[PDB]
Each structure stands twice: as structure tokens, then as C-alpha cells.
Structure 1
Amino acid sequence: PRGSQILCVGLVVLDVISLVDKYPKEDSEIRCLSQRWQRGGNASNSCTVLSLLGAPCAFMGSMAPGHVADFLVADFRRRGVDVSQVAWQSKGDTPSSCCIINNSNGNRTIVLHDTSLPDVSATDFEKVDLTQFKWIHIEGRNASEQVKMLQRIDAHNTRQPPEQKIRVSVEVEKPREELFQLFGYGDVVFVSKDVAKHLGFQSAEEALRGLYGRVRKGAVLVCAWAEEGADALGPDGKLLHSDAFPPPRVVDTLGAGDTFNASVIFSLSQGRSVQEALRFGCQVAGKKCGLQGFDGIV
């Protein structure tokens, strides 16, 4: 535990999954093919992927003590994911969602139950021993609070040898304008196709060109575009692309996004080029889209 772990900060959510033949028409009744529970949320799913990739990692997000959280915790621990930094709440419930996964094309429809659960705070983050970590990934959410956490990492970085920087990634996944300030932080910034489209952009290339001016100097902006693979753009101005690796049957895309991000991070943290990390990201996400859940992606 000396700059050896990856940390992801974001949501952990109980995903109550129904696998169906066809997405139900409104006001109809359909019998699902199979049912399961999955530990979800973005940062949490990334830890699943990191752990399967063999990277020691740690999750940090809010949970309320409970049966739900007990299942989540057992799950994390079964994966060897570090929960030591979890910010336990005494107020609110563990969030949960119903996910209907369409077995015929892998589409996933998520009915999210937002609880009270208050977010991980600057002050929570204050308590964290940054020295454990080589890489810290932040799922954009409570921006102002996270901006301070990023400020904290910058701080700790300035006072360390180049050999001992903590690399930082950020994801701006959700269309809300609160998050747009997050583009300014981190060595790697992941911007979702949803965010990109919601800002008027029609492809990864366009989005990268359109938004690069918002990242910080030296940063790599990354934009995955579902079956069209993923693109990246660094300080050299050269657009990089990877085709997708679609499985012959796409059966489950829940967590595809997070699988790509974790795989990109893992690859970069292993010292691979951005081009190689973009391909690996698309490769692992493609493998994942052909399987239910996350086992067997490697």
C-alpha cells in the first residue's frame, strides 16, 4: 500500500435486474426470463472491472447501514475491493434501481430511486490518506464539493516528485451544467455521448474538438460513442480512435460505460499509450456487452 491502489469515488447502487425478451409496451404485462441483484453505480461498477483486471482498488461513496448495504459490502469484499473509505450516513436509505435488460439487444432501462443519501463531501475526502493511491477517479456529481477534492489532490501533487504524482480522472456523464466545471480537473476527462449530444455534438470527433478547450493543460479528453467505438484527444492535437469490439450478440449493456472507463484507467495506469488504452477499453466493454453482468470479461 504505497501508491499501489486505484480509488473510485462515486455512487454504489443496488441494481434489481429483470432480463426480458422484449421491452414491455406501456400498460402491458410481460414475464421476465430471469432476475438478479447486482452491485451497481458508476464508480462501483468500475471497481468491479478494476478488480477483475487485477488492479488493487478501493471504492469511496455514501452508504446507509442496512440489509442492502450489507449485500453491497459483501459483494465488494468478494471482489477484494477496499471499502475502508466508505462514508457511512446515519440519514437516508441505500439507493436502488429497477433495471430491465432487454436480452434481444442489450438495451438497459433504469428506474432509479434517489434516496436522501448525502454525497461524499470535501470534508469526507479530507480524511483520506492519498498516499495509498496511484490513481484517483471521480464520478462527477456534487461538483463544488468534488472540485475541492480535486484541489486537494493538486495540492498533494505539487508537493511530490514527478515519480510520485497521483494521476486523476474525472467522468462527466450526466447532462447537468453543474458538472461542466469538472472538465478543468484531472489528467483524463471522460465525457459521455449523452453529455456530448446534449451539448449539440453529433459524433465523438466533433465533441472532442468542441470541448478540448475546457480541459486543463496536458489533459486527455476521452469520449466513448457506444457501438461506434471511442475517441480521444490529447495536447498534441492528434485525434485518436478505436473501433468497438461488438460481440455477435449484444445481451447486456448495463455498466458498459463503466467497463470502458475502468479499462482505460487500468491501461493508462499500466503505462500504455492512449491509443492502446482506448482499444483496450473498447475491447473489455465489448466483451462485457455479450455477457450478463461482469464475470468472464477477462
Structure 2
Amino acid sequence: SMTRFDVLTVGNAIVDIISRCNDQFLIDNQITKAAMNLIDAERAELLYSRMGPALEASGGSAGNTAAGVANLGGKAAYFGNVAADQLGDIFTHDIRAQGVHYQTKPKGAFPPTARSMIFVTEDGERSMNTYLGACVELGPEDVEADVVADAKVTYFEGYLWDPPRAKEAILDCARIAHQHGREMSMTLSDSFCVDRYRGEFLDLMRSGKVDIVFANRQEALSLYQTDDFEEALNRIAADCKIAAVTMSENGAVILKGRERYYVNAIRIREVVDTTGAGDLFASGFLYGYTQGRSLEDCGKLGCLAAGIVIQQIGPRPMTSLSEAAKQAGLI
């Protein structure tokens, strides 16, 4: 039985810089609402100069997912590259403090640690503006082969296709994982990210490099360039062994071959900030999965964690997910 890690995640190591804004701010600054907008250093300086007083919190989609698995009680690890600077030190502290194995060594102080200016509108939607900085350095040299070998599931971001060499690391992970009888998982990350890497993502799924795919409605529609969600569901199920597809307030559906398991979203008092919802859905699902739970229960765990994170500021729940899971009888 004894495997060192339940879930290894791999992603862009990012610190979030968070501010609430009005709707007009997104229009004036040509920020695509609800999306991840890549920006260069000049634009990062420009947007920051226009941003209100902010809060900082460790982010990165996969980073959040790893933290969420640890909070739930699972054994997690993380690969992601920061710089040797104060933001890097924050990132390192926060993920390690949650009890995630994190050992990726910074390569120097420049480029500096990635940051994402995240603007949260009154509806709770989040629009991210990301300077990748030190994330561009993540490569095959950062694969801790023993960790991939000893993790039940290695999960990675579609976002990793933006930096130049991260994809090589992921192909190395896929090889090591499958050689050791483990599983690979990916998230489609963002609908524009899917627009950029559609062919490569489909090839990952169809070649069997990815066993479990996470998508939201928008990403699924984008993957097949369709407006027909039923078509998207049918096609994604044909392309990967297990698909977990989130539908915001309408919950989730888990697909396996011809099987579909629908799960309801939880009751929200108020949607504060949706940042991290998809990441924490993956935390809940992968925690359940690596505990041998039913696909329906994995979905329920995902929706529980996602529901909690959207009721706070910050992409990583500050409360105990394991305690919430116990109260909810998901255990």
C-alpha cells in the first residue's frame, strides 16, 4: 500500500495581489473579465500603478490545489519555480506551512517571482493579470523523479503551456508516473488557454499521457469549439478516461466511459471572491480519489471545498477542510 504522496501538483508558482474593482475598471484597462490575462513587465507596472490598495496571498492554480489536498488531510507535493526574493520567500513559506512537500530550488533573483494582479468585481468574479517572471525557468531539471514515482496522482495546469520549457517537465512526469503505475491529471485552466493549446491538450488526452481531466463549462466548450455543452460532454468522455466538469453554481458532472455522475453545488451565503474555486474543486476530487472514494463522493468533496473557498478572500481556504468534510459526513 504505502505510497509517499497522494497528489503531486505542478504549476506556475505565483503570488496573488488582490483588489476589488468596479466593472468600468476592466473595460477602461481592456482586461478580459473572468480570464487569465498574460502581461509583460511594463504592463504589470502600469496595471499596478492603477490598482487600489491590495492584499497579497500565495496563489498558483496547482499550488492552491496542493494546499487544498493537504488541508483535507492528504499527502501533497508541489513543483513550481519562484525567484530568490521576498515574494518567493512568501510563496515557499505558505505552501510548506500547509504541509506540502516543496523543494523546487530558485535559480536566482531574476526574473523575479511571478505575480498576478487579480481584480474582483462586485459579482465576485475574478480577472487575473499575470506576469510569469521566474515561472519561465521551470524545466525538466525541476522534476524530482522519486516524488513522481511515489505519488498516486500527478496533476498539472494547462497554464504550463505558456512558459517555454515546462511542457518538457510534464512529459517527463507522464513517463515516470505511468512507468510506476500512477495516474496523470490535468486541468484545462482557462478557456483562452485552451484556445491557445487546443491541439496539444487533445493530444495529451488521446495519447493517454493524461488519465483524468478537469474542465469548467467554458473550457469544455472551447476545447471542441462548440456552443453545445452536451456535445462537449460526449466528446470529452471519449477523449479521456475520467473527466470532471464543473458548472459553477450548477455543480459538477463526473464522466467515466458511458457513466455520468452529477453533483450539486453547496449553499452559498454570499459569493465573496471566486478565485480558486476550480483549484479547490480539484483538491476535493483528488483527495477523495486517492482515498478510494466513489466518483460521486469525489465530486461532492470537490464541490464542498470549492464552495468554501469562494466565501473568503484568498485562493486557499483559511479554515479546516477536513473539519468541514466531517461535518458534511463526507469524512
The alignment's TM-score, normalised by the length of structure 1, stands at 0.84
RMSD, matched Cα: 2.6
Residues 212 and 35 (structure 1), Cα distance of their counterparts in 2 relative to 1, 3 Å cut = same
CA deviation profile, 1:31-86 (whole Å, cap 9, x unmatched) = 95x731111111101122112112121111111211110111111122122112x1
Tell me which residue corresponds to 2:82. Answer: 63
Q: Deviations over 1:185-237 (max 9, x none)?
A: 2332112333222233446543220222222xxx21111121221111113x0
Partner of 1:14: 15
Residue 3 of structure 1 aligns with which residue? 3
Q: Please, which of 265, 279, 283 is the counterpart of residue 300 of structure 2?
A: 279
Cα contact 1:288–1:297 (8 A) shared by 2: no
Q: Report the Cα distance in structure 1 between the residues aligned to 2:4 and 2:294, rounded to whole angstroms.
A: 20
Counterpart residue number, 2:231: 206
Equivalent residue for 1:195, pick from 219, 242, 246: 219
Give the drift of 1:111: 1.2
Pick aligned residue for 1:150 from 153, 170, 174 = 174
Q: CA separation of 1:203/1:270 partners in 2, compared to 1, >3 Å: closer, same or farther?
A: farther
| Residue in structure 2 matched with residue 169 of structure 1 by the alignment | 185
Tell me by how many angstroms 1:245 deviates.
Answer: 1.6
Change (3 A) 1:223 1:128: same
Quote the offset at 1:283 in angstroms: 2.0
Q: Secondary structure at the match of 1:291?
A: coil
On the 8 A contact 1:13/1:41 being kept in 2, the answer is yes
**Shift, 1:115, TM fit:** 2.3
Distance in 2, matches of 1:297 and 1:288, equals 11
Give the letter for the 1:290 counterpart: Q
Q: Aligned-pair distance for 1:156?
A: 2.4
Residues 54 and 243 (structure 1), Cα distance of their counterparts in 2 relative to 1, 3 Å cut = same
Deviation at 1:30, TM superposition (A): 9.5
> Could you tell me which amino acid in structure 2 is paired with residue 230 of structure 1?
A
For residues 131 and 210 of structure 1, what CA distance do their matches in structure 2 show? 31
User: Partners in 2 of 1:98 and 1:234 — Cα distance?
Assistant: 37
Task: State which of 212, 227, 232 in structure 1 corresponds to 2:249.
Answer: 227
> Structure 1 residues 204, 265: CA separation in 2 closer, same or farther (over 3 Å shift)?
farther
1:169-195 deviations in whole A, cap 9, x for unaligned? Answer: 222223122333222323321123332
Secondary structure of residue in 2 paired with 1:11 = coil
CA contact (8 A) 2:188 2:215 kept: yes
SS at 1:252 equivalent:
coil
Counterpart Cα distance in 2 of 1:203 and 1:189: 19
Consecutive unaligned residues of structure 2, counting only runs of 5 or more, are 30-48, 162-166, 322-331
CA distance in 1, matches of 2:253, 2:188: 15
2:120 matched to 1:98?
A: no
Give the corresponding residue for 2:44: none
Q: TM-score, normalised by structure 2?
A: 0.76
Of the three residues 260, 271, 277, the one matched with 2:281 is 260
For the Cα contact (< 8 Å) 1:12–1:61, is it kept in 2? yes
Shift of the 47–71 alpha-carbon distance from structure 1 to 2, 3 Å rule, reads same
Identity fraction in percent: 23
Retained in 1: the 8 A contact 2:155–2:184? yes
User: Alignment length, in residue pairs?
Assistant: 282
Contact residue 19 and residue 120 of structure 2 kept, 8 A: yes
Could you tell me which runs of 5 or more consecutive residues in structure 1 were left unpaired when the two chains were aligned.
158-165
Mapped to 1, the partners of 2:267 and 2:14 lie a distance apart of: 27
Give 1 or 2: higher helix fraction. Answer: 2
Task: State the Cα distance separating 1:87 from its structure 2 match.
Answer: 4.6
8 Å CA contact 2:187, 2:213 repeated in 1: yes
Secondary structure (helix, strand or coil) at the match of 1:135 reads strand
For the residues of structure 1 that align with 2:127 and 2:147, how far apart are their CA atoms? 37
Residue 291 of structure 1 and its aligned partner are, at CA, apart by 2.0
